[PDB]
Nucleic acid binder design. Structure first.
Length: 118
DNA sequence: GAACTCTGTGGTTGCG
DNA sequence: CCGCAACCACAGAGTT
């Protein structure tokens, strides 16, 4: 599906909603794509940091690279990012040595998530 | 049946 | 004083 470029010329990840509700399933399945070669089985995790929150509590943030793609099963953000602020996520691919791909200011996570005006 | 899970609406409220 | 954008609670309807 939709893909965005990361900090690294070797990895591309799915595009994430601009604003999403904590502990709620994502509208798409987050995936990480490897252009170079990554042997199957290789682990990939994702961390979501912020100026305020340092590494938001996540759910299901670890996947294994199957045929150049690490399909995350129902990844979820439990920690909030702070009024008006977003999460930058770090993609770490555990090959030797570990490679890293950062997806700057990707998604804001609030208790309500996007809501109809009042 | 109890105990979750999910998603929307209502009550509040600092900070512009 | 107004409102947005957040937080907190919890109701209703499904699930496990």
């Amino acid at each position: 599906g939709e893909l965005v470029r990361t900090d690294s010329p070797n990895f591309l990840c799915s595009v994430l909603p601009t604003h999403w509700r904590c502990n709620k399933t994502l509208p798409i399945a987050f995936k990480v794509v490897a252009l170079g070669d990554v042997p199957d089985g290789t682990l990939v995790t994702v961390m979501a940091g912020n100026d305020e929150n340092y590494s938001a509590e996540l759910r299901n943030a670890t996947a294994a690279m199957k045929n150049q793609v690490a399909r995350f099963n129902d990844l979820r953000f439990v920690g909030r990012s702070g009024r008006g602020k977003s999460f930058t996520l770090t993609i770490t691919v555990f090959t030797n040595p570990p490679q890293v791909a950062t997806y700057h200011r990707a998604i804001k996570i609030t208790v309500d998530g996007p809501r109809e005006p009042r």
